[PDB]
Design a protein around this nucleic acid. Structure first.
Ligand SMILES: [Cu+2]
Length: 293
DNA sequence: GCGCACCGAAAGGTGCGTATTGTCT
Protein backbone atom coordinates (compact mmCIF):
# COMPACT_ATOMS: atom_id res chain seq x y z
CA UNK A 1 0.00 0.00 0.00
CA UNK A 2 1.20 3.51 -0.84
CA UNK A 3 -0.42 6.70 0.41
CA UNK A 4 0.80 10.22 -0.11
CA UNK A 5 0.16 13.41 1.75
CA UNK A 6 1.40 16.86 0.95
CA UNK A 7 2.89 18.44 4.08
CA UNK A 8 2.20 22.10 4.85
CA UNK A 9 3.22 24.22 7.86
CA UNK A 10 0.38 22.90 10.04
CA UNK A 11 1.83 19.39 9.57
CA UNK A 12 5.39 20.35 10.52
CA UNK A 13 4.59 19.11 14.01
CA UNK A 14 3.69 15.68 12.63
CA UNK A 15 7.26 15.66 11.31
CA UNK A 16 8.16 14.98 14.94
CA UNK A 17 6.21 11.73 15.22
CA UNK A 18 8.44 10.31 12.48
CA UNK A 19 11.17 10.25 15.11
CA UNK A 20 9.02 9.13 18.06
CA UNK A 21 9.78 5.53 17.11
CA UNK A 22 6.46 4.42 15.71
CA UNK A 23 8.86 1.52 15.35
CA UNK A 24 10.49 -0.14 18.33
CA UNK A 25 12.60 -3.30 18.30
CA UNK A 26 14.54 -2.46 15.13
CA UNK A 27 14.56 1.25 15.99
CA UNK A 28 17.23 0.44 18.57
CA UNK A 29 20.14 0.95 16.16
CA UNK A 30 19.12 -2.39 14.63
CA UNK A 31 19.49 -1.42 11.00
CA UNK A 32 18.43 1.93 12.46
CA UNK A 33 14.91 3.18 11.76
CA UNK A 34 15.90 6.35 9.86
CA UNK A 35 18.00 6.81 6.72
CA UNK A 36 18.54 9.61 4.17
CA UNK A 37 18.08 8.87 0.46
CA UNK A 38 18.37 10.62 -2.88
CA UNK A 39 20.93 12.22 -5.16
CA UNK A 40 19.78 15.52 -3.67
CA UNK A 41 20.62 14.30 -0.17
CA UNK A 42 24.04 13.19 -1.42
CA UNK A 43 24.39 16.66 -2.93
CA UNK A 44 23.93 18.11 0.57
CA UNK A 45 26.34 15.63 2.11
CA UNK A 46 23.77 13.48 3.90
CA UNK A 47 23.82 9.73 4.42
CA UNK A 48 22.99 7.23 7.14
CA UNK A 49 20.73 8.02 10.10
CA UNK A 50 18.57 11.13 9.75
CA UNK A 51 19.48 14.02 12.05
CA UNK A 52 16.47 15.44 13.88
CA UNK A 53 18.09 18.87 13.80
CA UNK A 54 19.10 18.93 10.14
CA UNK A 55 15.79 17.35 9.10
CA UNK A 56 13.85 20.03 10.98
CA UNK A 57 15.89 22.65 9.15
CA UNK A 58 15.30 21.18 5.70
CA UNK A 59 11.61 20.95 6.57
CA UNK A 60 11.78 24.67 7.25
CA UNK A 61 13.58 25.24 3.97
CA UNK A 62 17.13 25.88 5.14
CA UNK A 63 20.09 24.23 3.40
CA UNK A 64 22.46 26.13 5.68
CA UNK A 65 25.64 26.10 3.56
CA UNK A 66 25.48 29.81 2.77
CA UNK A 67 22.07 29.79 1.09
CA UNK A 68 18.94 31.85 1.69
CA UNK A 69 15.66 30.42 2.98
CA UNK A 70 13.64 28.66 0.27
CA UNK A 71 10.06 29.08 -0.87
CA UNK A 72 9.96 32.82 -0.14
CA UNK A 73 7.87 33.17 -3.33
CA UNK A 74 5.00 31.42 -1.57
CA UNK A 75 1.92 33.62 -1.69
CA UNK A 76 1.00 34.58 1.87
CA UNK A 77 -2.62 33.60 1.15
CA UNK A 78 -1.44 30.03 0.49
CA UNK A 79 0.09 27.20 2.51
CA UNK A 80 3.86 26.82 2.70
CA UNK A 81 4.67 23.26 1.63
CA UNK A 82 7.42 21.56 3.57
CA UNK A 83 7.32 18.21 1.85
CA UNK A 84 5.51 15.21 0.47
CA UNK A 85 4.87 12.18 2.63
CA UNK A 86 4.88 8.80 0.88
CA UNK A 87 3.90 6.05 3.30
CA UNK A 88 4.64 2.44 2.35
CA UNK A 89 2.79 -0.19 4.36
CA UNK A 90 3.45 -3.89 3.90
CA UNK A 91 0.77 -6.58 3.71
CA UNK A 92 -0.42 -7.71 7.15
CA UNK A 93 0.95 -11.27 6.91
CA UNK A 94 4.29 -9.74 5.95
CA UNK A 95 4.25 -7.53 9.05
CA UNK A 96 3.42 -10.62 11.13
CA UNK A 97 6.20 -12.73 9.63
CA UNK A 98 8.76 -10.01 10.35
CA UNK A 99 7.59 -8.58 13.69
CA UNK A 100 5.78 -11.44 15.43
CA UNK A 101 7.72 -14.48 14.16
CA UNK A 102 10.77 -12.23 14.07
CA UNK A 103 12.56 -12.24 10.69
CA UNK A 104 14.94 -9.34 10.11
CA UNK A 105 15.28 -10.37 6.45
CA UNK A 106 11.66 -9.33 5.89
CA UNK A 107 12.59 -5.91 7.27
CA UNK A 108 15.43 -5.70 4.76
CA UNK A 109 13.07 -6.88 2.01
CA UNK A 110 10.72 -4.04 2.88
CA UNK A 111 13.54 -1.49 3.03
CA UNK A 112 14.76 -2.50 -0.42
CA UNK A 113 11.28 -2.46 -1.93
CA UNK A 114 10.96 1.05 -0.51
CA UNK A 115 14.38 2.26 -1.65
CA UNK A 116 13.93 1.02 -5.21
CA UNK A 117 10.56 2.69 -5.46
CA UNK A 118 11.98 6.01 -4.23
CA UNK A 119 14.64 5.81 -6.98
CA UNK A 120 11.70 5.79 -9.39
CA UNK A 121 9.94 8.66 -7.64
CA UNK A 122 13.22 10.56 -7.85
CA UNK A 123 13.35 10.13 -11.64
CA UNK A 124 10.10 12.12 -11.57
CA UNK A 125 11.46 14.97 -9.44
CA UNK A 126 10.82 18.27 -11.19
CA UNK A 127 11.33 21.98 -10.75
CA UNK A 128 10.18 25.03 -12.63
CA UNK A 129 12.25 27.83 -14.15
CA UNK A 130 11.24 31.03 -15.90
CA UNK A 131 13.14 32.91 -18.64
CA UNK A 132 11.78 36.21 -19.96
CA UNK A 133 8.29 35.32 -18.80
CA UNK A 134 8.38 31.89 -20.40
CA UNK A 135 7.97 29.06 -17.90
CA UNK A 136 9.49 25.61 -18.37
CA UNK A 137 9.37 22.39 -16.39
CA UNK A 138 12.66 20.68 -15.62
CA UNK A 139 13.10 17.04 -14.66
CA UNK A 140 15.85 17.48 -12.09
CA UNK A 141 16.03 13.86 -11.06
CA UNK A 142 17.15 14.66 -7.52
CA UNK A 143 15.35 14.44 -4.19
CA UNK A 144 16.24 14.80 -0.51
CA UNK A 145 14.41 12.10 1.43
CA UNK A 146 14.13 11.27 5.09
CA UNK A 147 12.96 7.67 5.59
CA UNK A 148 11.48 6.56 8.91
CA UNK A 149 10.53 2.93 9.57
CA UNK A 150 7.82 2.11 12.12
CA UNK A 151 6.28 -1.16 13.30
CA UNK A 152 2.87 -0.64 14.91
CA UNK A 153 -0.62 0.59 14.02
CA UNK A 154 -2.68 2.94 16.19
CA UNK A 155 -4.16 -0.15 17.83
CA UNK A 156 -0.70 -1.61 18.54
CA UNK A 157 -1.06 -4.33 15.92
CA UNK A 158 2.07 -5.30 13.92
CA UNK A 159 2.21 -2.80 11.04
CA UNK A 160 5.47 -2.60 9.11
CA UNK A 161 5.67 0.72 7.33
CA UNK A 162 7.99 3.51 6.32
CA UNK A 163 7.33 7.21 6.01
CA UNK A 164 9.34 8.51 3.07
CA UNK A 165 9.30 12.24 3.65
CA UNK A 166 10.28 13.92 0.42
CA UNK A 167 11.41 17.41 1.25
CA UNK A 168 10.04 20.27 -0.85
CA UNK A 169 13.35 20.96 -2.59
CA UNK A 170 15.36 20.06 -5.66
CA UNK A 171 18.55 21.25 -7.41
CA UNK A 172 18.26 22.42 -11.03
CA UNK A 173 20.96 22.17 -13.72
CA UNK A 174 21.94 25.79 -13.13
CA UNK A 175 22.75 24.75 -9.56
CA UNK A 176 19.74 26.48 -7.94
CA UNK A 177 17.57 24.83 -5.29
CA UNK A 178 13.85 25.25 -5.94
CA UNK A 179 10.56 23.96 -4.62
CA UNK A 180 9.57 20.57 -5.97
CA UNK A 181 6.95 20.43 -8.73
CA UNK A 182 5.22 17.32 -7.37
CA UNK A 183 2.73 16.69 -10.20
CA UNK A 184 4.59 13.67 -11.56
CA UNK A 185 5.23 11.98 -8.21
CA UNK A 186 1.76 12.73 -6.86
CA UNK A 187 -0.02 11.50 -9.98
CA UNK A 188 2.23 8.40 -10.05
CA UNK A 189 1.19 7.22 -6.58
CA UNK A 190 -0.79 4.19 -7.77
CA UNK A 191 1.99 3.18 -10.15
CA UNK A 192 4.64 3.60 -7.42
CA UNK A 193 2.54 1.47 -5.10
CA UNK A 194 2.67 -1.34 -7.67
CA UNK A 195 6.43 -0.95 -7.96
CA UNK A 196 6.64 -1.33 -4.17
CA UNK A 197 4.36 -4.35 -4.24
CA UNK A 198 6.36 -5.97 -7.06
CA UNK A 199 9.73 -5.26 -5.45
CA UNK A 200 8.50 -6.54 -2.09
CA UNK A 201 7.09 -9.71 -3.63
CA UNK A 202 10.33 -10.33 -5.47
CA UNK A 203 12.34 -9.89 -2.28
CA UNK A 204 10.01 -12.19 -0.34
CA UNK A 205 10.20 -14.93 -2.92
CA UNK A 206 14.02 -14.82 -2.78
CA UNK A 207 13.79 -15.59 0.93
CA UNK A 208 11.69 -18.60 0.05
CA UNK A 209 8.13 -17.45 0.78
CA UNK A 210 5.08 -18.44 -1.22
CA UNK A 211 2.69 -15.59 -2.01
CA UNK A 212 -1.08 -15.71 -2.35
CA UNK A 213 -2.39 -12.98 -4.66
CA UNK A 214 -5.95 -11.83 -4.18
CA UNK A 215 -8.44 -10.16 -6.49
CA UNK A 216 -7.06 -6.65 -5.84
CA UNK A 217 -3.59 -7.51 -7.10
CA UNK A 218 -2.29 -7.45 -3.56
CA UNK A 219 -0.74 -10.36 -1.72
CA UNK A 220 -0.05 -11.99 1.62
CA UNK A 221 2.17 -14.91 2.57
CA UNK A 222 0.43 -18.21 1.74
CA UNK A 223 0.66 -19.78 5.20
CA UNK A 224 -1.59 -17.16 6.84
CA UNK A 225 -5.33 -17.02 6.14
CA UNK A 226 -7.78 -14.14 6.13
CA UNK A 227 -9.25 -14.74 9.59
CA UNK A 228 -5.74 -14.72 11.02
CA UNK A 229 -4.97 -11.46 9.24
CA UNK A 230 -8.15 -9.84 10.54
CA UNK A 231 -7.21 -10.83 14.08
CA UNK A 232 -4.24 -8.46 13.80
CA UNK A 233 -6.17 -5.81 11.87
CA UNK A 234 -8.08 -3.88 14.55
CA UNK A 235 -8.08 -0.50 12.80
CA UNK A 236 -9.63 -2.23 9.79
CA UNK A 237 -12.37 -3.63 12.01
CA UNK A 238 -12.94 -0.20 13.59
CA UNK A 239 -13.35 1.36 10.15
CA UNK A 240 -15.74 -1.37 9.09
CA UNK A 241 -17.77 -0.81 12.26
CA UNK A 242 -18.07 2.88 11.49
CA UNK A 243 -19.52 2.20 8.03
CA UNK A 244 -21.91 -0.35 9.52
CA UNK A 245 -23.11 2.10 12.18
CA UNK A 246 -23.69 4.67 9.44
CA UNK A 247 -25.49 2.14 7.27
CA UNK A 248 -22.92 2.94 4.59
CA UNK A 249 -21.67 0.60 1.89
CA UNK A 250 -17.86 0.37 1.76
CA UNK A 251 -18.25 -0.48 -1.93
CA UNK A 252 -19.22 3.13 -2.65
CA UNK A 253 -18.40 5.89 -0.17
CA UNK A 254 -17.44 9.50 -0.85
CA UNK A 255 -13.95 10.63 0.12
CA UNK A 256 -15.57 12.55 2.96
CA UNK A 257 -17.21 9.41 4.34
CA UNK A 258 -14.06 7.33 3.90
CA UNK A 259 -11.79 9.86 5.64
CA UNK A 260 -14.46 10.40 8.29
CA UNK A 261 -14.48 6.67 9.08
CA UNK A 262 -10.67 6.49 9.21
CA UNK A 263 -10.13 9.54 11.41
CA UNK A 264 -13.24 9.37 13.63
CA UNK A 265 -12.90 5.66 14.37
CA UNK A 266 -9.46 6.25 15.88
CA UNK A 267 -9.15 5.61 19.60
CA UNK A 268 -6.93 7.30 22.20
CA UNK A 269 -3.18 7.06 21.47
CA UNK A 270 -1.66 5.38 24.54
CA UNK A 271 1.92 4.18 25.04
CA UNK A 272 2.94 0.53 25.38
CA UNK A 273 5.71 -1.80 26.53
CA UNK A 274 7.46 -3.05 23.38
CA UNK A 275 8.69 -6.05 25.34
CA UNK A 276 5.21 -6.94 26.60
CA UNK A 277 3.55 -6.07 23.29
CA UNK A 278 5.50 -8.67 21.32
CA UNK A 279 4.60 -11.35 23.87
CA UNK A 280 0.99 -10.33 23.37
CA UNK A 281 1.40 -10.60 19.59
CA UNK A 282 2.86 -14.07 19.98
CA UNK A 283 0.13 -15.24 22.35
CA UNK A 284 -2.52 -13.83 19.99
CA UNK A 285 -0.86 -15.54 17.01
CA UNK A 286 -1.07 -18.95 18.70
CA UNK A 287 -4.74 -18.40 19.58
CA UNK A 288 -5.48 -17.56 15.95
CA UNK A 289 -3.78 -20.85 15.07
CA UNK A 290 -0.98 -19.21 13.09
CA UNK A 291 2.00 -21.30 12.05
CA UNK A 292 4.95 -19.02 11.31
CA UNK A 293 6.52 -21.96 9.52
C1' DG B 1 -1.85 24.49 -13.21
C1' DC B 2 -5.03 22.56 -17.34
C1' DG B 3 -2.39 28.95 -16.10
C1' DC B 4 -3.50 32.17 -12.66
C1' DA B 5 -2.58 35.14 -8.75
C1' DC B 6 0.04 36.39 -5.86
C1' DC B 7 5.12 36.37 -3.45
C1' DG B 8 9.60 38.60 -3.52
C1' DA B 9 13.14 40.81 -6.31
C1' DA B 10 16.40 36.82 -9.71
C1' DA B 11 12.56 40.13 -17.66
C1' DG B 12 12.47 35.62 -10.90
C1' DG B 13 9.15 31.96 -7.76
C1' DT B 14 5.18 29.66 -5.47
C1' DG B 15 0.89 27.64 -4.20
C1' DC B 16 -2.98 25.64 -6.40
C1' DG B 17 -4.78 20.74 -7.93
C1' DT B 18 -3.03 16.41 -8.17
C1' DA B 19 -4.33 11.86 -5.15
C1' DT B 20 -9.12 7.70 -5.23
C1' DT B 21 -6.28 -0.21 -3.44
C1' DG B 22 -5.26 -1.85 2.32
C1' DT B 23 -2.45 -4.05 6.12
C1' DC B 24 -5.37 1.80 7.22
C1' DT B 25 -2.17 9.37 9.95
CU1 LIG C 1 4.19 5.44 11.23
Amino acid sequence: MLSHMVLTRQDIGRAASYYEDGADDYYAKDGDASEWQGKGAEELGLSGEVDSKRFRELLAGNIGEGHRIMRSATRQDSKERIGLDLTFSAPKSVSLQALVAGDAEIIKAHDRAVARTLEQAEARAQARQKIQGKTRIETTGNLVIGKFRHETSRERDPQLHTHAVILNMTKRSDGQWRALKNDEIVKATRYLGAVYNAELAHELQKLGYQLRYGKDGNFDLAHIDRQQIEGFSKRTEQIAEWYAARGLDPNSVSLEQKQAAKVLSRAKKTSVDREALRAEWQATAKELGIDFS
